[PDB]
Amino acid sequence: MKISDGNWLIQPGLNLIHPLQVFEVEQQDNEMVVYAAPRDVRERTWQLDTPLFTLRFFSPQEGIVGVRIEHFQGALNNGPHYPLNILQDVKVTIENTERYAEFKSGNLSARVSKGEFWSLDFLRNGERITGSQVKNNGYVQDTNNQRNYMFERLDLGVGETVYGLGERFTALVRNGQTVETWNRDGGTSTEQAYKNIPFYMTNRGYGVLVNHPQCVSFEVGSEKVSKVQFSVESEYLEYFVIDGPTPKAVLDRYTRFT
Amino acid sequence: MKISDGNWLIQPGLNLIHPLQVFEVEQQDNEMVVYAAPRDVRERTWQLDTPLFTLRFFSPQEGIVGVRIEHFQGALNNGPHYPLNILQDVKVTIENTERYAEFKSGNLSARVSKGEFWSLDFLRNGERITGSQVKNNGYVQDTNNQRNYMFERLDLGVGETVYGLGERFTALVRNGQTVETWNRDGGTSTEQAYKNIPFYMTNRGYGVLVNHPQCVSFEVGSEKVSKVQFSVESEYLEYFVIDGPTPKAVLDRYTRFTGRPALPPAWSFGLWLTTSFTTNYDEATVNSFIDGMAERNLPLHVFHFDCFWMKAFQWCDFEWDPLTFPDPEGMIRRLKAKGLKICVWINPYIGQKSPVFKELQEKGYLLKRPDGSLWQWDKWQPGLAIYDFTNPDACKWYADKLKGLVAMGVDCFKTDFGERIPTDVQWFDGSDPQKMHNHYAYIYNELVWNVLKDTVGEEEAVLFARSASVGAQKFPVHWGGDCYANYESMAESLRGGLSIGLSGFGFWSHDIGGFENTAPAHVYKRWCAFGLLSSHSRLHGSKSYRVPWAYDDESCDVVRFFTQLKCRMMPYLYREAARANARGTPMMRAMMMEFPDDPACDYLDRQYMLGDNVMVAPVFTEAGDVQFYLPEGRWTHLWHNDELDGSRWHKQQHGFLSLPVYVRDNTLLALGNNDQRPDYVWHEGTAFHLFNLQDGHEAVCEVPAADGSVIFTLKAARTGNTITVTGAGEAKNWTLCLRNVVKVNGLQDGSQAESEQGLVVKPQGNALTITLH
Amino acid sequence: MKISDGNWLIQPGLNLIHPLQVFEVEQQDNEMVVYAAPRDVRERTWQLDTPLFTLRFFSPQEGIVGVRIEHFQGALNNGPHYPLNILQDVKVTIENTERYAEFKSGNLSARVSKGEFWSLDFLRNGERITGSQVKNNGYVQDTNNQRNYMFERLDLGVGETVYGLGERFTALVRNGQTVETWNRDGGTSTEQAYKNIPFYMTNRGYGVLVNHPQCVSFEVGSEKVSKVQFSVESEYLEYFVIDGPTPKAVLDRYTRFTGRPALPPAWSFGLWLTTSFTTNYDEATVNSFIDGMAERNLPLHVFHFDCFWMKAFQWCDFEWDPLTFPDPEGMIRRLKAKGLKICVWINPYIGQKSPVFKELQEKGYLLKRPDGSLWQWDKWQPGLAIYDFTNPDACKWYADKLKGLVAMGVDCFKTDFGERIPTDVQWFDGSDPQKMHNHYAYIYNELVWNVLKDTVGEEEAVLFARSASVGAQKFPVHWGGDCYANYESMAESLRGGLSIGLSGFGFWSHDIGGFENTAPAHVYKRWCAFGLLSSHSRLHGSKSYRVPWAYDDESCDVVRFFTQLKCRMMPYLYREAARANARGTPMMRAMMMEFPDDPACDYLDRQYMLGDNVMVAPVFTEAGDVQFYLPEGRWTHLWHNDELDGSRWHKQQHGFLSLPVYVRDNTLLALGNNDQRPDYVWHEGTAFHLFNLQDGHEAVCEVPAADGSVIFTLKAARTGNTITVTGAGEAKNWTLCLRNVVKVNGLQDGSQAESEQGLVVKPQGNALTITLH
Ligand SMILES: O=[N+]([O-])c1ccc(O[C@@H]2O[C@H](CS[C@H]3OC[C@@H](O)[C@H](O)[C@H]3O)[C@@H](O)[C@H](O)[C@H]2O)cc1
Ligand SMILES: O=[N+]([O-])c1ccc(O[C@@H]2O[C@H](CS[C@H]3OC[C@@H](O)[C@H](O)[C@H]3O)[C@@H](O)[C@H](O)[C@H]2O)cc1
C-alpha cells in the first residue's frame, strides 16, 4: 500500500503519526513496554493533546522477538488468530538504561534508543541485522476512505535479498515487488497465489512473520527500495523477528513456532 | 437556524406548515388542548387531506405556563429529560369561549384567538407581555437533509432586551445573536460555552425555558429582528413561559422549577490557591508556597491539587503519582492541620496508558460505539475514553474512587471538563445521544455532589465545576474557565459571570489573573480586587504559581487587603448567599436585575451588584480610570466613605488598593471582627454600619448562622430626627456605626465614641434610640 | 464565516496559514512592503518549501492607512472596483528598524514587529487603537468546497462598540452579530439589507473599509468576542483604517475617500405624497387627492407616480398606460402649475409582456447567461430580465428614456430595486459577477443621477433610492424600504436610518405609517412626527390611500403641525444639510456620534440628534409614554419651552401633537417665517432663538443661502451679565428671542417686546447689547 509519495511527500489524504520519542519504559515480568510519543514531550506543557504509541516486546520461543505496536486498544479485535505455539516461560533479559531499552531472547535483541534520536534496532549478539528508522512505523489515517492502518518498514542491507511470502510464481527474489497476502484462485502464471503466508526471510539469516490473518500489504523494496514495508488495516501491528543465523535455522524456529 | 430568507421568501428546500386556525378546543382536567389547522377548515370539504397541530397548555408550577406544540405523536422520544419539578395540582383557570381559548396560572395566561385571525398571546393580568403571531410557529420539513424541526418565534417589544442562555462571553444583551445550546470546550473568548442553558429572560419581567436537552437553535433578534426564534429537530416543541414581573421573581420561579442553588459552606468563600498546572508539585514545593503566604500575612483557606497529582497520560484514573507523592494522605493531613481545606482535580475521561483502563474496558464501564468497540480519541489524553455514567456499575466504580479520596481527607473536587460528549455512540441505558450530550454534565456533577453529601455531608459539599446543564445549579460552584491575562479577557469573564446568574446559577468562581503564565502585574492587581469581590475566588496559573510575590510587594498588599476585606464582609455576604439558595438570586447581579425599572441599566456589563446593597465596578485600565453608573440614591464608598449621587454616570481614578465599591442609601450592613478567615461566628463582635438613613425609612440587617438561617436581626427606623434601633435574636458585643455622622444631639440606652467613619454607638438596654442634629 | 472552532480548534476541513515572521522589508517610494513567512525562516534550510505573504502599506488620503495582504498574485482579479478617491502624493513617513517597520500617514500608523513576536499594530500618535495579533490573519484553504479565503481580525478594547455596515435593522451596536455585505430584498424586519457597506466604525474614534465589492463576511464579536473578524473569498485582502479621533472626523475622511453626499435641493425637504401602490390612478383621481390636501391646508410639495403609471407586467418599459394616461405631459404640467414637483417610479428590470422586451433582447441590452440566453425569472414580473448597465449602448438607451420623462416635466425618480442581481451570468464588459452583485446598485443610481445632472442641473438632482453600495451616498436621498405598520417596525426603521448615517450616507427618507394598508391611527400619528423630523419625509400606502382624513380629523392636524414645523425649521435644517455635503455628517445622528465621550449614549437607538442642536425622541406607544436620555446641559423644548437638566434619563407623556424635541444649551437657532414650503428666503424675516447662554460662552448661528453657503452669521457672547450680539452678512427684518427670559436690565442698540416664549429683541445699529437682571 502506498504511504509515502517519493522521499519528500505523503500520498494525498493520508495523515501519518510515528513513534519518535521514548516517554517511559516498564518491565512487566518477562515483557518490556515502551511508551513512545509522536512529538517532543520532555516538558509537561506538551504531555497532553497528543497520541501515544504502546510498544510491547515479548518472546514466544527462544530466538524470536515479538513486537506489538498499538494505537487504540478499544477496537474489537475478533479472531480467528494463527495457530501459534507460544511459551510463557522463555528465558529473556530486559535492560532499561538511560541510553536504551533492550529486550533479548537467545542471541536476538530488540533495542530502542531513548532521547532525541529514536531508533528501533534488531541485534544479533550486539550487531544490527535490521531495524526501523524513525518515521518508518506508525499509524495511517486515510481520510479518503475512512480506514486506518498500522505499518512498519524493516531495513535491508547492501546485497540483502528477500524470499518467501508463500507459493508465488513471480521472480523468486522479492525485491521490487508488492505482495498482498490474500488467497486467490488465479492459476500459476500471475502475481496471485492460492497459498499466502505473511512470512519472509532474507539472505542475512533472519525472518519475519507479520502476525495478521487478514490481507497484509508488503512493499518489498517497492516503495522504499532498501526496506520491507508492511501495513495492515488494524489499530495494532504485531510481528515477530526470527533469528537464524542461517536460512535453515530460521526455518527451524519458524516451524517450531507455527 | 435560518428558516426565512428575508421577509418575502423561505430558505430553499424548506417546507413550512403553521397552526393558522382553531378547529377545536378541549378541556382535559387542568389542561387545555387546542387542535389547529394549517389552512381554513371551516367547511367540511377541507376537513381532510391536511396536517393538524395539537397544542397542549399545562402548568407545572404557579405562574408557569407550559406550551406543547405537536405534529406526530408516534415518534420514539427517549430521554434523558430535564430534572423539572412538575406539580399535578396547580390551581388554574380554563375558559373556552366563542372568541378565545384561555389557560391561566397565577397572573400569567395563554390566550388563543379563535376564528379567522389566529393569535397566541401571553398575558399578565390581561396585558400582553409577548406572544406568537400567525405563521411564526410550526413545522419545518427540510427536504435538503430529510430532517424535520419544530419552531416558535416569541415577540420582543420596543426596547425589549434578552439575557441568559447560560454562561456565555458574547455581548451581554443577546439581541442580534445566534445561540446554539450545545456544550463545548472553546475557552472563554468565543461564542462557545461550557455551560449552555436553553433559558432566557428579558427586561419585560418574564422568562422562557425551551424544554429540550438536545441542541436548541436560538435566533435572538438575528433572523426576525424583533423576535426570539427557537427551533429543535423534533416532532414536538415544548416551552415554558415564566412570569415575574421582575427578574428576581422570574429566577425564583425558574429555580423552584429546575433546582435551587445549594448553599455552600462558609470556608468555601475564602481564598483558594492551586499548584498551578504544568509546574512541578511535591510536598516541599507545595509547603514553600503555603509558608510563603503565611510569612507575608496573606490568609489562605483552600488549597487545590491540579492534574499532575496523577501520572501524565493516565488522567483521570485516581492514582497518585508515587514519585511526586510518596505519602498522599500524610501530606494532606499535614496541610489540614494548618486549617486548610483540600481540593483535587477530577474529570470524567480516562487515558489508555492507565493500568486501570483495561479493567474498565473489560467491565464495560466506558462509552461504546454502536458496534460495541470503545469510543476513543487522542484529544486531552491519548486513547481517551469516557466513563459511561448511564451504566450504574460504572457510576459505582467512579463514586468509590471519589470516596477513597474523601476518606484520605480530601474535602472537595474540581469537576473539570464534561463538554465534548460524542453522539455516534450507544449509551448503556439506550438514551438519545443528542440529549445526552448536554445532560452528561448534569449526571457527572450530580454523581460527585452525592459522594460529598453521603460522606462529609451536604452542608460541607462544594465543587468548582466547568460544565453544566439545566438543573446543575443545584451543585455549586461554577467556575468561569480558562482566560488570557489581559483586560479584554477580564471583561469577557465578567460577562460570563453575570450571564450565568441570569441563567439560574447562584455562585460563580474564577481565577485571578487568568491562566496565561505571565500576567502583567497591573492586570493581576485589578483582577485580584474583582476576584475577591466575587462569590468565589481562586489563584491558579499555568506554568508557575499565581502567588503575588511573583510580581511585587504591592501585589502582596493587594491580595492581603482584599482577602481581609472579604473576610470582614462575610456576615453580609453569607446572608446574600442564603438568598441564592432560597430564591435563586445570584450573588453577582447584573445591574438590570437589581434595578429593573432603570433604563440606564439595560446594557451595563462592566459593573454589578454584590448582594442587595453593594455596587462593584472593577477597574479595567493600568492607570486606574473607571467609569460606572449609579442608580437613584446617595451612595457611599464602602471604606473611603465618599458619597455620590445617582441616576447618572461617574468617572474616577483608583490606585491598586481601590475601586468603586458603593453602598446604597438606607442600608444597615454587618461587618465582622475577623479578617483572617471567612468561617467564624459572625454574630459576635459584629460591627454594624448605617448608611444614609432617610426620614421615613427603615434599614434591616439579617445576620446569618453557619447554616444561613437568620440568627439576629437589627432594624434602624427614622422618623423626624429620631432613629429607633431594635434587635431580635442572638448576638454579643456588637456596635452600630453612624457612617459620616460626626455628632449627635443625644442618645438613649447606649454609649458613644468618635471614629474616622463616624460615631460608633454601643448599646445598653434597647431603646438604643439616637437623636440627630 | 466560521474559521475557528472555539479557542483551541479549527473548523473541520480548513487549513490555515498566517504571517508569523518578518523576512524582509522594502520601501517602494511612498509604500512599505513587508514579506512575512508563516514559519521560522531565519536559517536558509527553511527558506524554501514555504508559503510567503506579501503585505503592502500605502495611504490614499491623509489619516488613512491601506493594508494589502496577498497570497497568490496570479489570480484574475477582474473588476468592478469601488469608486475610491486615491491620491498618489500623500505625505507619509516610512521607518525600517531592527525592531519594527512602521508606515505613517497623519497621526495614524501601522507598525509591524520583527523577530519572534509578530504583531501588526495601528497607532494614533504612537498609542495603539487596534491591531491584529499573530495568527488572526492569513489564508484559509477550505478543503470541503475547494474555495480559498483571506481573513483579518482587528481587536476591540474594553467597552468598545461597533457601528455601521450599511442600513441594517438588527440591534444598533453590532457586537455579537454576523454580517454579510450582500444586497438583498428582505424587507426591513430581518438581518438582510438592501444597502450593504463593508465599513464599520467604533466608539474609539476610528473606522475601517474592507475594500471588496463581493460579499464580505463579518463576525463582529461573534467568533472571537473581542475582535472584528472579516473574510472574503480572494487571494488577497485589502482594507483601510481611517482615523478620527472622533466619529464625525472618521466620517469626514470616509466620505472624502469614497464620496461626499450631494446637497439635495431645498424643495426636496418638503412633504412627498404618492399615488399609493394599487390605486387606479387617472388625472381626475390624482387631482382629487391633491385637492383634498390643499382644501385641508396640508402643505404639499412633491407628488410621486408609483408602478402603475406603466402597464401591468411591463415594468419598467417607460410607456405611460394609454388608457389611464392619454396625455402624460399635459397632466404633469397641470400638476406642476399647482406648485408641485413630480417624481416617478422606476426600476432596472423589465417584464417579458412589454413590447420593448423583444427590442432589447434583439439589441443585446439585457443580462445574459453564459450560453447567450437571457437570464429570466418570474419574481416581481413575469419572465423578468435585467438591463445590462455594463453595456454602454444599454445605458444610453435607458438614460434616453429618462431624458424623455424629464423633457415632459418629471423632476426626479424613485430608483427602486437593484438588489437581486444574479451571479450565474455573463456581463457585457466581462466583470466579476460576484463583485457586480452589490456594485450594480452604484452603476444604476450613478446613471440616473447623471441624467438629472445633465438635464435639470446638479443643484436640482435628487432621488429616493432603495439600494446602495460604497460611493452611492453621492446620489441622495436613500429611502428605508417597506415597513409594517406597528411600533416595533417603526423602531426597527430608526435603527436602519441611524445605521446608514454611520455608513457615510448624509440623508435618509422613509414612509409615514409604512406600507401595509391598515395601521391604527395612533401609529400613523406617531410615525408622522418622526417622518417630518427626518431629513426626508413621505406619505405612501399599499392598497390604502395614505391621506390622513381616512383616519380621523386629528390625523390631519398632526400632519399639518409637523409639516408647518419642518418648513419653519428649514433655515436650521438646510445649514445642517450642507454639513452632510461638506463633511459627511448625517442630518440624523446616533447619540454616540454627537456625544462620543458620554458613556450613557453608547447603545441609544430610540432617539437621535437632528443636526447639531436638537434631540428628537419619537414616541413608540399609543398612550404617549416615552423615556429618553439627555446629555449634560439644560435643554429646552423647542415649542413647549419647558427645561430639563441633562446627564440623566427622563420620562414623559405626550399627546399626538407632541414628542420630546429638545434644544441644547448655549444655542442660537434660526426659525423662518414660512410654514408652507421648505424653499424660501430664509434670511429675510428670520426668527432667531437663543437658548440658555451661560456666562463665558458664545452661540453661533449660520443662516445658509439656497446653495448651502453661509449668507448670514449671528453670534451671541456672554461675559458677566452682558450678552453681545454680532451679525455679519446679509439678513433683513430679523428678530432675537431670549427664551425663558421675561425681563432684562437693559438694551443698547435694540428694542424689546414681550412674548410667551421670552423677550423678543429687534436690532438697530448692531452695537446690539443686552444686559441681564
Ligand atoms: O498552559 N499549558 O501548558 C497548556 C497546555 C495545553 C493546553 O491545552 C488545552 O487545555 C485546555 C484547558 S486546561 C484545564 O485543565 C487544567 C487546569 O489547570 C485548568 O484550570 C483547566 O481548565 C483544555 O480545555 C483544552 O481542551 C486543551 O486543548 C492548554 C494549556
Ligand atoms: O538539507 N536541506 O537544507 C534540505 C532542505 C529542504 C529540502 O527540500 C527538498 O529539496 C529537494 C532536493 S534539493 C535540489 O536543489 C538544491 C540543490 O543543492 C540539490 O542538489 C537539488 O537536488 C527538492 O528536490 C525537493 O522538492 C525539496 O522538498 C532538501 C534539503
mmCIF file of C-alpha atoms in Angstrom, chain B residues 2 4-9 11 156-160 169-171 173 175-178 184-192 194 204 221-226 379 420 482 484 487-489 491-492 495 515 597-600 602-603 605-606 620 627 629 647-649, chain C residues 2 4-9 11 156-160 169-171 173 175-178 184-192 194 204 221-226 379 420 482 484 487-489 491-492 495 515 597-600 602-603 605-606 620 627 629 647-649:
data_model
loop_
_atom_site.group_PDB
_atom_site.id
_atom_site.type_symbol
_atom_site.label_atom_id
_atom_site.label_comp_id
_atom_site.label_asym_id
_atom_site.label_seq_id
_atom_site.Cartn_x
_atom_site.Cartn_y
_atom_site.Cartn_z
ATOM 1 C CA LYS B 2 -32.306 30.073 9.271
ATOM 2 C CA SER B 4 -36.916 32.654 6.416
ATOM 3 C CA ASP B 5 -34.914 34.228 3.598
ATOM 4 C CA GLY B 6 -35.818 37.825 4.370
ATOM 5 C CA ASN B 7 -39.396 38.948 4.810
ATOM 6 C CA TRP B 8 -40.606 37.640 1.483
ATOM 7 C CA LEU B 9 -39.041 34.239 0.880
ATOM 8 C CA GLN B 11 -34.860 29.197 2.622
ATOM 9 C CA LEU B 156 -39.989 41.393 21.586
ATOM 10 C CA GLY B 157 -41.374 44.884 22.221
ATOM 11 C CA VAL B 158 -39.690 48.220 21.537
ATOM 12 C CA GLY B 159 -36.553 48.430 23.680
ATOM 13 C CA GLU B 160 -37.014 44.849 24.946
ATOM 14 C CA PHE B 169 -18.864 35.524 26.666
ATOM 15 C CA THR B 170 -20.526 37.413 23.850
ATOM 16 C CA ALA B 171 -22.151 40.782 24.443
ATOM 17 C CA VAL B 173 -27.593 41.605 25.736
ATOM 18 C CA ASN B 175 -30.304 40.759 20.598
ATOM 19 C CA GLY B 176 -28.549 40.220 17.293
ATOM 20 C CA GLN B 177 -27.083 36.876 18.347
ATOM 21 C CA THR B 178 -27.485 33.366 17.217
ATOM 22 C CA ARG B 184 -18.287 22.826 24.056
ATOM 23 C CA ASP B 185 -14.713 23.306 25.212
ATOM 24 C CA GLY B 186 -13.965 26.626 23.423
ATOM 25 C CA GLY B 187 -12.336 28.774 26.089
ATOM 26 C CA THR B 188 -13.792 31.983 27.407
ATOM 27 C CA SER B 189 -13.138 34.071 24.307
ATOM 28 C CA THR B 190 -15.648 32.799 21.703
ATOM 29 C CA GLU B 191 -19.372 32.275 21.027
ATOM 30 C CA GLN B 192 -18.949 28.828 22.540
ATOM 31 C CA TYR B 194 -19.145 25.093 28.522
ATOM 32 C CA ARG B 204 -40.103 42.916 30.409
ATOM 33 C CA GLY B 221 -33.332 39.151 17.022
ATOM 34 C CA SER B 222 -30.972 37.636 14.411
ATOM 35 C CA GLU B 223 -33.482 36.386 11.811
ATOM 36 C CA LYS B 224 -36.585 38.325 12.653
ATOM 37 C CA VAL B 225 -35.106 41.353 14.398
ATOM 38 C CA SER B 226 -37.955 41.827 16.863
ATOM 39 C CA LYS B 379 -7.647 14.882 22.338
ATOM 40 C CA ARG B 420 -17.051 17.097 24.405
ATOM 41 C CA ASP B 482 -9.579 29.321 31.061
ATOM 42 C CA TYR B 484 -5.942 35.081 29.000
ATOM 43 C CA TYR B 487 -8.193 43.475 30.475
ATOM 44 C CA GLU B 488 -10.317 42.439 27.436
ATOM 45 C CA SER B 489 -10.350 38.871 28.754
ATOM 46 C CA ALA B 491 -14.172 41.909 30.780
ATOM 47 C CA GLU B 492 -15.468 38.959 28.855
ATOM 48 C CA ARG B 495 -19.971 38.965 31.083
ATOM 49 C CA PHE B 515 -4.298 31.194 33.337
ATOM 50 C CA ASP B 597 -37.072 49.868 36.021
ATOM 51 C CA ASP B 598 -33.977 51.961 35.289
ATOM 52 C CA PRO B 599 -33.415 52.309 31.556
ATOM 53 C CA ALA B 600 -29.810 53.357 32.084
ATOM 54 C CA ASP B 602 -30.127 47.685 30.222
ATOM 55 C CA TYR B 603 -26.633 47.200 28.787
ATOM 56 C CA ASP B 605 -21.856 44.773 31.789
ATOM 57 C CA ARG B 606 -18.688 46.196 33.423
ATOM 58 C CA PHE B 620 -10.015 47.694 33.503
ATOM 59 C CA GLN B 627 -16.456 54.809 34.502
ATOM 60 C CA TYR B 629 -23.331 54.177 36.573
ATOM 61 C CA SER B 647 -29.224 58.383 38.405
ATOM 62 C CA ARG B 648 -26.026 59.203 36.456
ATOM 63 C CA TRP B 649 -22.594 58.151 35.273
ATOM 64 C CA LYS C 2 -16.642 30.434 10.910
ATOM 65 C CA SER C 4 -12.021 28.711 14.429
ATOM 66 C CA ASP C 5 -13.888 26.046 16.463
ATOM 67 C CA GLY C 6 -13.532 27.706 19.871
ATOM 68 C CA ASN C 7 -10.146 28.819 21.178
ATOM 69 C CA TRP C 8 -8.442 25.518 20.728
ATOM 70 C CA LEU C 9 -9.535 24.101 17.400
ATOM 71 C CA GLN C 11 -13.284 24.132 11.716
ATOM 72 C CA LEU C 156 -11.742 45.578 20.191
ATOM 73 C CA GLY C 157 -10.985 47.035 23.610
ATOM 74 C CA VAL C 158 -12.915 47.056 26.883
ATOM 75 C CA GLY C 159 -16.355 48.641 26.189
ATOM 76 C CA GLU C 160 -15.547 49.177 22.521
ATOM 77 C CA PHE C 169 -32.316 46.637 11.085
ATOM 78 C CA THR C 170 -30.697 44.433 13.762
ATOM 79 C CA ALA C 171 -29.601 45.912 17.106
ATOM 80 C CA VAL C 173 -24.401 48.078 18.218
ATOM 81 C CA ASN C 175 -21.061 43.329 18.718
ATOM 82 C CA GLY C 176 -22.422 39.742 18.697
ATOM 83 C CA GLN C 177 -23.567 39.823 15.067
ATOM 84 C CA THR C 178 -22.537 38.150 11.899
ATOM 85 C CA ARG C 184 -30.946 41.692 -0.740
ATOM 86 C CA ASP C 185 -34.659 42.391 -0.989
ATOM 87 C CA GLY C 186 -35.523 41.077 2.519
ATOM 88 C CA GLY C 187 -37.787 43.836 3.821
ATOM 89 C CA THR C 188 -36.950 45.974 6.870
ATOM 90 C CA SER C 189 -37.540 43.351 9.598
ATOM 91 C CA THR C 190 -34.643 40.942 9.149
ATOM 92 C CA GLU C 191 -30.902 40.596 9.167
ATOM 93 C CA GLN C 192 -30.900 41.281 5.400
ATOM 94 C CA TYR C 194 -30.890 46.499 0.591
ATOM 95 C CA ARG C 204 -12.851 54.614 19.855
ATOM 96 C CA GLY C 221 -17.511 39.895 18.112
ATOM 97 C CA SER C 222 -19.439 36.733 17.092
ATOM 98 C CA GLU C 223 -16.496 34.301 16.699
ATOM 99 C CA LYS C 224 -13.766 35.984 18.735
ATOM 100 C CA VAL C 225 -15.881 38.086 21.072
ATOM 101 C CA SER C 226 -13.382 40.968 21.329
ATOM 102 C CA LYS C 379 -40.164 37.058 -9.296
ATOM 103 C CA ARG C 420 -31.387 40.713 -6.544
ATOM 104 C CA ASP C 482 -41.100 48.537 3.026
ATOM 105 C CA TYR C 484 -45.124 47.105 8.532
ATOM 106 C CA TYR C 487 -44.260 50.451 16.795
ATOM 107 C CA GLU C 488 -41.697 47.683 16.697
ATOM 108 C CA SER C 489 -41.400 48.127 12.911
ATOM 109 C CA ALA C 491 -38.187 51.324 15.943
ATOM 110 C CA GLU C 492 -36.504 48.854 13.555
ATOM 111 C CA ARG C 495 -32.063 51.806 13.778
ATOM 112 C CA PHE C 515 -46.611 50.388 3.523
ATOM 113 C CA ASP C 597 -17.296 60.907 25.313
ATOM 114 C CA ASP C 598 -20.636 60.306 27.101
ATOM 115 C CA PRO C 599 -20.891 56.630 28.031
ATOM 116 C CA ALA C 600 -24.689 56.957 28.532
ATOM 117 C CA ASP C 602 -23.267 54.045 23.539
ATOM 118 C CA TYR C 603 -26.447 51.971 22.944
ATOM 119 C CA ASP C 605 -31.207 53.810 19.454
ATOM 120 C CA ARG C 606 -34.726 55.175 20.089
ATOM 121 C CA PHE C 620 -43.451 54.372 20.354
ATOM 122 C CA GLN C 627 -38.223 57.595 28.068
ATOM 123 C CA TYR C 629 -31.624 60.315 27.783
ATOM 124 C CA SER C 647 -26.744 63.790 32.132
ATOM 125 C CA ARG C 648 -29.825 61.717 33.017
ATOM 126 C CA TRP C 649 -32.892 59.865 31.732
#
